[PDB]
Design an enzyme around this catalytic site. Structure first.
Site, PDB file in Angstrom:
ATOM      1  N   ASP B  18      44.010   2.722  62.166  1.00 46.33           N
ATOM      2  CA  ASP B  18      43.934   3.913  61.327  1.00 46.33           C
ATOM      3  C   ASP B  18      43.936   5.107  62.284  1.00 46.33           C
ATOM      4  O   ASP B  18      42.893   5.516  62.824  1.00 46.33           O
ATOM      5  CB  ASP B  18      42.673   3.868  60.459  1.00 46.33           C
ATOM      6  CG  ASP B  18      42.523   5.093  59.554  1.00 46.33           C
ATOM      7  OD1 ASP B  18      43.212   6.115  59.778  1.00 46.33           O
ATOM      8  OD2 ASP B  18      41.667   5.042  58.639  1.00 46.33           O
ATOM      9  N   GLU B 110      30.764   6.439  63.587  1.00 46.28           N
ATOM     10  CA  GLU B 110      31.642   6.284  62.437  1.00 46.28           C
ATOM     11  C   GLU B 110      30.855   5.363  61.495  1.00 46.28           C
ATOM     12  O   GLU B 110      30.813   4.130  61.646  1.00 46.28           O
ATOM     13  CB  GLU B 110      33.036   5.769  62.845  1.00 46.28           C
ATOM     14  CG  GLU B 110      34.111   5.946  61.771  1.00 46.28           C
ATOM     15  CD  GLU B 110      34.022   4.906  60.705  1.00 46.28           C
ATOM     16  OE1 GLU B 110      33.088   4.981  59.885  1.00 46.28           O
ATOM     17  OE2 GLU B 110      34.882   3.988  60.687  1.00 46.28           O
ATOM     18  N   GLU B 119      27.996   0.351  51.854  1.00 46.08           N
ATOM     19  CA  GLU B 119      27.812  -0.348  53.120  1.00 46.08           C
ATOM     20  C   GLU B 119      28.002   0.587  54.299  1.00 46.08           C
ATOM     21  O   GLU B 119      28.623   0.245  55.301  1.00 46.08           O
ATOM     22  CB  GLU B 119      28.742  -1.560  53.183  1.00 46.08           C
ATOM     23  CG  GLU B 119      28.371  -2.596  52.112  1.00 46.08           C
ATOM     24  CD  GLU B 119      29.268  -3.818  52.037  1.00 46.08           C
ATOM     25  OE1 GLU B 119      30.249  -3.931  52.793  1.00 46.08           O
ATOM     26  OE2 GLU B 119      28.971  -4.690  51.194  1.00 46.08           O
ATOM     27  N   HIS B 269      42.203   4.138  55.968  1.00 49.65           N
ATOM     28  CA  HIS B 269      41.771   2.833  55.482  1.00 49.65           C
ATOM     29  C   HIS B 269      40.714   2.907  54.395  1.00 49.65           C
ATOM     30  O   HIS B 269      40.456   1.930  53.707  1.00 49.65           O
ATOM     31  CB  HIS B 269      41.269   1.942  56.641  1.00 49.65           C
ATOM     32  CG  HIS B 269      39.878   2.259  57.107  1.00 49.65           C
ATOM     33  ND1 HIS B 269      39.581   3.327  57.920  1.00 49.65           N
ATOM     34  CD2 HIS B 269      38.699   1.641  56.865  1.00 49.65           C
ATOM     35  CE1 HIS B 269      38.275   3.368  58.139  1.00 49.65           C
ATOM     36  NE2 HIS B 269      37.718   2.349  57.516  1.00 49.65           N
TER      37      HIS B 269
HETATM   38 CA   LIG Z   1      33.691   2.138  59.950  1.00 46.41          CA
HETATM   39 CA   LIG Z   2      30.021  -6.536  50.238  1.00 45.11          CA
END
Ligand SMILES: [Ca+2]
Ligand SMILES: [Ca+2]
Ligand SMILES: [Ca+2]
Ligand SMILES: [Ca+2]
Ligand SMILES: [Ca+2]
Ligand SMILES: [Ca+2]
Ligand SMILES: [Ca+2]
Ligand SMILES: [Ca+2]
Ligand SMILES: [Ca+2]
Ligand SMILES: [Ca+2]
Lengths: 325, 325
Positions: B18, B110, B119, B269
């Site tokens: 990316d 990041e 997440e 992404h």
């Molecule tokens: Ca990441």
């Molecule tokens: Ca998951």
């Protein structure tokens, strides 16, 4: 209200949107109009009912469309919408226990799975042939052929080589990640479903089995394994990544119509079944490759495809790799 | 030997491939060279280590690269290969319990997930800020902004309309399948990660939250929900399918550098997070849409993204839909 049928509609959309598949059936059924006209048909695993309707349009007097999954309800509605409720009858449940009021003149089915035999309906088609098909009756398609070729997968080559190219784009050397990527992408024993093109094919494809669906003994062959030996010679210098397996099926000509899943032919939803070696092997023009490939049931599940590969590249020792979906 | 790390390499490949993401970090870090020169950095969730190396290349005297997943071993090798083992130190395990030998002048990470907060490592970045960052220290990126827009998803429109078009290609009416496809593709409460383009955007995107990562109270806001009200007016006649949510993050200018995940900007992404209504709603030019959107933890798992949507389209009653990844 909320529903959990996203996957169901997606699978049927993918199959009907596969024009190579769906047009091959439409035309293959129509090519057999003389044999279907005024006759009765059983459609094994009829899905949304489209093939059953094609059979009625080819002139079948009656079609029994058997489907065990939830989608049978949609098929009944499709049949009604096309004005065929008097002639096409949707019967829920597995064909092994359905009750038809008569034997049939023909069986039509799109039964093929990934790698031909993964989660295929072939055993159901053969059960129905034995139980419900009249002597001398027709199967559509009539036969299948299996092919194998060595491959140099250009997409995989790019993924493996990616790490060594990071320096040229970001100024950070990540070449050490290549060993890791190789282990992860190739050092497993899973069959990978992926679409290739002619550029990926490293030698002439070899037919390693032919299945005549009406033939005596086929059920027993499926249990024991369908396969054969192959030999070929590489076109040129490239990293050998493994082998691709694909199939075709043939509808009698009533010129037979062939529906192919070869990488050299138009793309289909079946793609090809890829069998990667644990790591790439350099080959050159005229490098000899030989081996044996066998498609097998898995122990836990006869419809989970196993492929046993034996292969010899040039002067290297013969190796074996046992793959499963 | 066989390994089970296909998914691991694929995730890291996707992120490094990316270019929008990775170049934004490379340049954002370099733009802060004056603040990083001769200073110490903590990289939270360092992955393969590439960002930690960018920090060293911007002149950091020392970088602590903390990574809990298995990939930390590859990061250590990458650091060594780039001649940085004396200055960049890879520490396995979660940052919440790592032992650094000193506080740091900057944190780089990041940390962003799908829909920004699915997440994500944000809570770990904030924990590290509190525990390890010197007073007055730098966070890179420094801030995030969240956006929402009504959408008419052209790909979805094609999928829904597919069934009504079967007749024109195969001569079988399947228009009844449209209701089924709608229920299946839209009548669920899952957040869908999908990439859109400007053609899908039905009104001016609206910023509904801004997060200054150094700000007091942010941890508590994350628990209570991050969000806000929005209002907009539709560009033209189209089926409204729901809303898209996306984000940007900003690196101080040391002109600030913005890394955007908008459908109007180059693809990343992260794609966008799509919130579909149960069925399409026709809208016209100047149809007013208003509502409220809140990003929340799930009960079972603070890092599983929940989005609560309230929305009013034109003169229709306000409705609520509670989504989760
Ligand atoms: Ca990441
Ligand atoms: Ca998951
Ligand atoms: Ca099928
Ligand atoms: Ca592909
Ligand atoms: Ca042969
Ligand atoms: Ca054989
Ligand atoms: Ca399965
Ligand atoms: Ca996409
Ligand atoms: Ca606002
Ligand atoms: Ca707010």
């Amino acid at each position: 209200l909320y529903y959990e049928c996203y996957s169901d509609v997606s699978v049927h959309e993918e199959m009907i949107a596969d024009q190579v598949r769906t047009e091959a059936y439409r035309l293959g059924i129509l090519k057999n109009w003389a044999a279907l006209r005024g006759k009765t048909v059983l459609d094994v695993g009829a899905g949304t009912g489209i093939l059953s309707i094609f059979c009625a349009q080819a002139g079948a007097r009656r079609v029994y469309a058997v489907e065990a999954s939830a989608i049978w309800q949609q098929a009944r509605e499709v049949v009604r919408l096309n004005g065929l409720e008097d002639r096409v009858h949707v019967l829920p449940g597995p064909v092994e226990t359905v009750e038809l009021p008569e034997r049939v003149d023909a069986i039509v089915s799109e039964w093929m799975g990934y790698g031909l035999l993964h989660e295929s309906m072939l055993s159901s088609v053969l059960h129905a042939r034995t139980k419900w098909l009249k002597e001398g009756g027709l199967l559509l398609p009539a036969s299948a052929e299996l092919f194998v070729a060595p491959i140099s997968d250009q997409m995989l080559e790019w993924r493996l080589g990616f790490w060594s190219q990071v320096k040229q784009h970001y100024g950070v050397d990540m070449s050490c990640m290549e060993s890791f990527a190789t282990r992860c992408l190739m050092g497993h024993s899973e069959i990978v479903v992926q679409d290739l093109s002619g550029e990926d094919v490293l030698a002439r494809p070899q037919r390693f089995a032919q299945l005549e669906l009406a033939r005596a003994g086929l059920e027993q062959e499926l249990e024991a394994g369908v396969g054969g030996r192959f030999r070929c010679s590489c076109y040129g210098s490239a990293p050998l990544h493994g082998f691709a397996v694909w199939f075709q099926v043939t509808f009698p000509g009533g010129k037979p119509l062939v529906l192919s899943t070869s990488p050299l032919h138009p793309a289909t939803h079946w793609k090809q079944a890829l069998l990667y070696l644990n790591e790439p092997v350099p080959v050159e023009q005229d490098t000899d490759i030989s081996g044996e490939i066998t498609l097998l049931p898995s122990p836990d599940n006869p419809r989970r495809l196993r492929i046993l590969l034996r292969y010899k590249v040039g002067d290297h020792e013969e190796k074996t790799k046992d793959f499963a979906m």
